[model samples]
Every structure is written in C-alpha cells, then in structure tokens.
Target: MNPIEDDLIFRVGTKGRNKGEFTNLQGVAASTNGKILIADSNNQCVQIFSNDGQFKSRFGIRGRSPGQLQRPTGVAVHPSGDIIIADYDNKWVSIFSSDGKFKTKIGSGKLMGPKGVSVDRNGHIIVVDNKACCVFIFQPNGKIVTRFGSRGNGDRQFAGPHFAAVNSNNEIIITDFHNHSVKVFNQEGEFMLKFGSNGEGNGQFNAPTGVAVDSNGNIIVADWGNSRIQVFDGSGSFLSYINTSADPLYGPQGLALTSDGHVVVADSGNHCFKVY
Candidate 1:
C-alpha cells in the first residue's frame, strides 16, 4: 500500500513517443468494457490502455485531415464503445470507433474551442466552449439539440467553461475554470445550481478544469491550481480530497472515472495520469 495515500494506486505516463508515455496530457476516460483512453494533447493522439495500465493501442495524428486530431481536450466513451473527442484546435467534435477508425466530425463555425465533451444517458453529446461562452448538446448523429449559457458570473452563465459530465441522475455538471466553480444543469439546458469558491478550503477550488461523476454518483473535480482532486456528494457536500499540496499533481487538466470505480487524472504539468 502507498504510505502516503491508500488511494494512490498507480501513476502512468511521462513525456515520450513510446506507449505509456504522454505529452501535455489533457483528457481521459474508461469505456464500458474497461479500456482506458488518454488524450495526449501535444503529442496529438489518443492512447488506449488495458485495465492494468498496459498500452493497448494509440490513434489519431496531428493534422486537419478527415481522421487526425488537433489540440484534443475532452475525451469520453460512448456506451457502444466508441471514442468521442473535442478537437479544440479544429473547433469541432469527432468520433471514432473503439478501434480508432474515424466515424465522423461534428461541427462548423458554431464550435469555438470545444474544450470539454461528455455523453449523457440519452446518447446526447454535450460540448463545452469557453470561447463561445456556451454549452451545446447534440444528438448522437451530430444534430444540434440546444445551446445555453453566456459569459458572466451570474446564474446560467459561465467563465472559462472547461469540462463537463452527466451524473447518475442525468444532471449536467460543469467546471468553470476561471470561476473556480461547478455548475449543475438539467439535460435540457436549464441551470440548476452551482458550488465552490476560489480557495483551498472545503467546497472551494482554484481553476478546477475537469469534472466527473463517479460510479457511486459522487462528484469529482480536478481542483487544478490547488494540486488536488476533490470529491463531493450528489448534493454538493464536500466528502474528501485525493491529493495534498505536496503530492505534486503538477497540474491536473482532465479526469475520468475508470470502469473499476476509481479515477485517473490527466496531470499536464508532469505529463502523466495519476490513478487513484
């Protein structure tokens, strides 16, 4: 067991071109069947690995081609085992089969830096855009359903919206990077509530970049600037923290709930994923 934290199960990746190595890691997720997917941003590819952290395969190259990825950020797994990516630099969302074959691209000028992406129970795709100051929902086939939010600190508004996840109850949860808060909204683009403040205390955050709903329906935030991942209950009650100031998350940019029920964080600062 880890003397420091029982939850620190393993640390994967560093800077390199080989399997198990990542550069500017930004997004991560686990498919329903248990494979782990990691988006290597600077490397311009998505890496897949087995449950034991063994590299399985990697796909996508840096380009504007029909099958390449550019500045990819958010990554998610569809119930059917496909991989969805918010190709930020390309200003669109793309999908690939579980084996990494290009499926389709979903976007136009309407998407401005689609930094975060998630799949809901209804098979809808939710994309978060900080530049557009809005969140968009699209049907599985790439048809726009609805869009909401604006740039502000008020209700239903977002500042630097980064990543999002749909909870057990189908509630949308988003992390506002600059605002250091997580906003909750119904599936139809209606705001519900929000939590967090700019600080290091409980229920507080500092540039929290990624958000995810765990298997138990708990909320997990990549409390980025503070060097930790914080957990909360369904009602936003602070539960616990996964890292301390000295733990060196470097800077977690994204997070995902593993099929095994733990979480893995994309630590951009050190170019790795800290699994816990």
Candidate 2:
C-alpha cells in the first residue's frame, strides 16, 4: 500500500463543548478569508473553520478576566483580519475582531506565559513566552516591538518556549521546548539559526511544538515528544513526514498552513484537528 498518497486531508474535532468540539487543541492559524483559526484550549474557545472543514464560528468565554478566555493558547491571523490569541490563563495577548469582536488586551506587565502566537510580516505581535523563556515583539497597539530569549540552555536560551513562526525573511521560527532546538530570529530578536537534537532520529527533536511557514519557505514542525509531523527546508533541512501513518497523531499541537494547501494540526491527544 505504498504508491504515493498520504497528504492526509481530513480529520476534524471530537472532545466536547459543542459545535465541532475540542478540549485541548492548541494554536493553529490561517486566515485571509479562507478561515481555520483554532485554539480551543480546554474549550476556552477560538474555533472557526471553513477552509473546507466547515463549523465556521466560535470565540472564547472561559473568563479569568480581560474580555474572557482563560487558556486559549496561541492563534494568529492579522493582516488586518485581527484575531490574535495566546491567553494562557490571561497572562495576556488577546485581540479579536474580524467578527469575533473582543478587541484588546496585550501582555500585561510583559507576558510571562503567552504560549505561542505569530503575525509578523511587519504586523509584529510574535510572542512565545512559555513562562518567560522570552520572545516578545508587540505593536499591534500595545506597543513594544523588541524582546528576545532568556531562560537558559545557552544560545539565546529558552527552556520551554513553544511556538512561533514567520518566515520568508521576517525570520523568527522558535520552538525550543526545554532546549531541544529550532530557533531562528531576526525581526529585531536577532539570534538567527538553530536546528534540532533530542533524538527520535532524522533531524532529531522530541519536544518541539507547532510552527508553520510554507508557501515555499518550508518549515512545518510539531513533533511534541515525537507524536510526529515534521518537515523542514527553509534552512533547517530534514524534509519529510506528513503521512501520519494513517490517523496516528496523539500529542500534536498547533501547526498551520492551510488556505487551501492543507497541513493543519492540533490533534492534542486526539481531541481532533488534522489536515495534512
């Protein structure tokens, strides 16, 4: 059964909180009208489909303060269509509108846990501060625009950084969970260049979590402890593995590159989301 054919292309949701349920799905983005922005972290909300996945509508409501949405872990999409999230228990970063409405609440005091977000081609807002391992670059009004890595293990440190992706020259492609690797920067955050090495073979990486950038500039990782999904080329090298062994993703989290080309992830232990 191997003559080509493994681009996945299906797999929706299933945990429960209603409409296309999901309990832990974290970060996923891609919208320019084609929608597909998901970050249903334990159902605190931010689901919106329709790039063929259907369920087109959803917005947070878990309440820990600020416009509400406590754990809505990372999601981006602002070329003006607004919608930027990353609210790990309201540690901050929540701006919506493009119909989802909420509107403003950037990193209060400087984001200590904003677990992932992206939107750089100058629109700024690229925070990934998994408990302050650092990486901020605001200016979607909350204004800051320049911050970098910090929590040790050397080379522009970061011990638990989770997600961030923005390429084609805007660089910045982090995902250094406990220092397993994948760290590029340069939209002022400087540290440009890093690979992987925590092993599971082939361009190693065991804790890496969600990151995206395609449209030729390749790099779409999410190997959360090896639950799979890895491809890279925009300088990082190991290109290949989007097959999923036919429905085999359990710890995957946040990953996007759809608008028609597909490669949406967030199968957080099977709470659904897969569209390779």
Candidate 3:
C-alpha cells in the first residue's frame, strides 16, 4: 500500500498566550455539531472551540468539586451529545451537558490512573487505567460492568495501556504505550490480534498514545514518539502514515474523527489541538 501523507493544515497555540490558563492541551474530541472539545490539561479544564480554531467558551476550574477538573486527560462525546471527561487527578469521570453544564460525577475513588476514555455503540463507557494496566467498562450511568487486561508483555497482556476506542464492529482497540504496539480485543476482552513494533520505520510505532477509528473502519493511531499518525486496516495491516509536516504535528496525543470526516488531533507537546 502507498504511504499515507500527513495533511496538516494549520498550527494552533503559536499566537496564543503561553500560560496555565489555556496552554498545553492534552485530549481532544469533536461534537456532532462541528464544534471541537479539548482538554486543556495544564489549564485544569476543558475548552470549546470553533471548527476554524476560534475560541468559543471555556469551563471547569482547578478543584475537586463536582464540575471542576484537575489533570483532565481524555475526553469523549456521548451519543446524546453530552461530554465525558476522564478527570485523572480527581480519580473520577465527569459528565457535562452539551452546553458545558455539569451533570454528575462517576467512578470517584474507584478509578486508578484513569487516563483515556470512550463511549461504545451501546453507550457503555470504556476507560483505560494506566496504573492498573487494564480497561474498565461501565454503563452509561457509570456502573462498572467488567474489566480486562493486565500488566505484561504477553499476547493478551498490556504494558501501560494508554488509550482505547471501540470500532464500528464494537471491537476494542487499545494502544500499549510501553509495548509499542496496538492490541485488539473482542467485546468480552478476548485478545484478537496485535500489530506494529518498536521503531521509526513504516508500520512501526514509538510510544503510541491515542487511537480512533475513522468512518471507513480504518484505524488511526497517534504515533507520539515519531510525531506522526499511522493508519492501518481493521485486520492489523499497515496501510499508510501521516507525518508531522503533513500537518506539522508535534507530539500528537489524542485524536477523534468529526462527523464531517475531519481529523481532530491534540498536538500536546505544542500545547494545541488542530483540525485537519
């Protein structure tokens, strides 16, 4: 297959004030209505922006309250348009209405190092727990349904599972950061397959962090160490790669596909998220 080219259109944060208020973004997700949601982690809150990179509104503060978020790392949009955030330092997941109103909190004191989160087709919430080396599943209402994976380098084991996503078929694809590869499992947590290795070459990934499935079922991985995006087939075959220059991605972390087919990436090290 032909190598995929990076299609970076613009860079963010270059002209913004580099302070704790809105600098150093971490996670990113897209709203159904074309708005972009970003976890301005270092700022201890989430910020909403227009599709064209214009700031719209901002919420959350540095606190342990019901709505306040600390070290917010991962974010996802529920089917009903609500926002779900993996508030890492708070040890809980927060739900916000589409308008950025705090709805409630879940997994308080139950989550160990909750880093990345996603909502499945059935509305079940999946969270990646880095410290626990496992993935925890919860109902939309925040009840723990089941969990899977453990710390190891074996076939079914995960060495620092960083991020996860449920594909169109509901299969869970997870990025094993320390293992330097992507692992797929069934809905029941059965290991299906694994791909990639530790390298800068094509089909290889260095510190793969975030992952998402495009509308076409193709897997897009944020190859952080390499500063690029790697695309692969559903069956684990390497398809192509998008480099930093294509979009000038610097330490791309979290990624999500918008309803309109645009790719939204959190260029964490650069402290900005770009829509390409």
Candidate 4:
C-alpha cells in the first residue's frame, strides 16, 4: 500500500439521543441514493444521514414490541429502498419503509441474537447471529434461504461472528470476533477460506468486527480490539490501513463505502461515524 495524505473527509454525531447524537453506534450502511444508515444501539434507533454528515431522520423507539426496536445492532438499505435492521434483544429482523414506516419483522423464532446484517447482490438479507454463532440468509418477505456455522474455531464455524459483506463474486465475507479472524463462504454457506489472528500486527486482528469489499475487490475490515481498520486483497492478503490518526478510531465497528465510493465506519467508542 502506498502512503497517502490525510483522507478524513467528514465525521458526525456526538453522545446523546438528539437528532444528530448517537449512543454506541454499531453498524453503518450507505444507500445508493447517498444516504447513510447507522444503528444506534443504546439509543435503540436507526439514524439516517446524508453522505456529507447531515442528519436526515431517525426511527424506532426503545422497546421490544413489533414496531419498536431493542438493541438494533446492524442496519442496511435494500435495493428496493427498504431499511433492514437486526434487532438484538427482540431476536428478529425488522424492515421499515424508506420513509421510516414499519413494514414487517422476521426471524423471531430462529434468530438467537442478530448482531450484524447486510444485503447480498441477490437481495438476500445476510444476518450474523452473535449468540447463535451462525449466519442466516432470508428473503425480503421473511423466507429462510439457508443458514450455517456453529460455535467453534473450525473453518466452518464462528466463535463470535459480528458482520458480513458480499464480494464481487457474490461470496460472503464475515468477521469472526472471538476467533480473531475473517472467514469467507460461498452464497450457499460453504466455507471458502479464513484469515487473520489475535495480534496487533498487519493482517492480524484482535477481535475483528465489521467488514466490506471494495469495488477493486479489496477487503476492508475493522479491528475492534485494536481500534484500527485494515485493508486486504480479495484472498485476504494484507494491503494497507485506512489511517485514522486525524481523529482516530476508538473501537470502530461496521464499515461501508458511500455511493460515491468514500469509506465510512461506525466509530463505536466515539459515538460517531467517520468518512474518508
């Protein structure tokens, strides 16, 4: 990787439940329309913002009801403009209209604790169940496509799976938190490979959390325990780091590139999100 000048373009949010405030922000997703979706966990709401850090709107009230949210850990914008959220405490996935109206909820009887979520190229909602130690694929209308993995360090298992992203080849890339690695699997839930370990060195991670694949087929990951982000090739070879020295990341979580290809991450400990 080549050294570049400071690329910190924007940062938003503070510590509160106000319009632009956040409490323990977790997953982040960029919509095709240049909007950003953030899962404000402690606030129990998903906040929407412009790519340039302007708060647009927010939804969800802290509760366990069907429309209310309790510990929303991950969020994503669907191709059809629906907002998908993984409600941890509710043990289900909620879908809201683009304008913030509750539509439906899924995975109640099956999902143990969904921590992160992503929509694949095929429009399937990819869910990382933290408590269940597995991943579940579901259609927009609440149909299960398939589910895989277990609680272990094996290649086909996950100790604490946090988030997932789809690659150019439509493969699933997951961040295994406790196992300290990232694992890849085909859309059908077949294990392809795994990388990283528990360390503060390049290509290594101390509990990896969020993951994203760039247009160039490179992988970007959040090293939660290390408070940094690292980039890698499609096959998991270390490339470089997205420097956060300007403001610095304190336990970053979910990551995504905006429609214009700018990097965005959930700076969890800082109660904000940064764009580069």
Best by TM-score: 4
Q: Which candidate leads in lDDT? A: 4
Model 4, span 1-276: residue lDDT tens: 765556588889889988889888888998999998999888888888998788899988889889899899989889888999998899999999998899999898999999989999899999999999999999888899999999999999999899999998889999999999999999999999999988988999999987888879999999889989999999999999988876789999989978888889999888889987
- Steric overlap count per candidate: 0, 1, 4, 0
lDDT (Cα, 0-100) at 173 in candidate 1: 93
lDDT of each: 0.85, 0.85, 0.81, 0.90
Tens-place lDDT digits, model 3, residues 33-69? 8877888766777777777777777777688778888
Clashing pairs in 1: none
lDDT of 2 by residue, 1-276 (tens): 655556677888888889889888889898867888888877788888888788888877888888888788989999888899988767999898977878788878778678898988888898898998998899888888788878898889999899999888898999997788899988899887899889898878889999898898889898888888888898899988777875789889889888787789988888988887
The deviation in Å at residue 217 for candidate 3 is 0.9
TM-score of 3: 0.91
lDDT score at residue 7, model 2, on the 0-100 scale: 67
Worst 10 residues of 2 by lDDT: 1-10
lDDT of 1 by residue, 1-276 (tens): 444545677777878867778878887888878788898777888999877788899988788776888788889899998899988888888899988899988876689888888999999998998788899999877789999999999878999899998987788999998888899999998999889999978989989887888878899999778878999998889999875444478788889888888788887888777778
lDDT for residue 126 in candidate 1, whole number 0-100: 89
Candidate 2 segments whose C-alpha is farther than 4 A from its true place:
2-53, 58-84, 87-92, 95-99, 112-114, 117-150, 154-160, 163-178, 181-197, 201-205, 210-243, 247-252, 255-264, 267-272
All candidates in order of TM-score, best leading: 4, 1, 3, 2
Against the hidden true structure, what lDDT does model 4 obtain?
0.90
- My TM-score estimates for the predictions, one after another, are 0.95, 0.35, 0.91, 0.96
Instruction: State the displacement of the C-alpha of residue 199, model 4, in Å, after optimal TM-score superposition.
Output: 0.6
What's the lDDT for residue 250 in model 3?
A: 71
Q: What is the C-alpha RMSD of each candidate to the true structure, in Å?
A: 2.0, 14.4, 3.5, 2.7
Model 1 gets an lDDT of 0.85
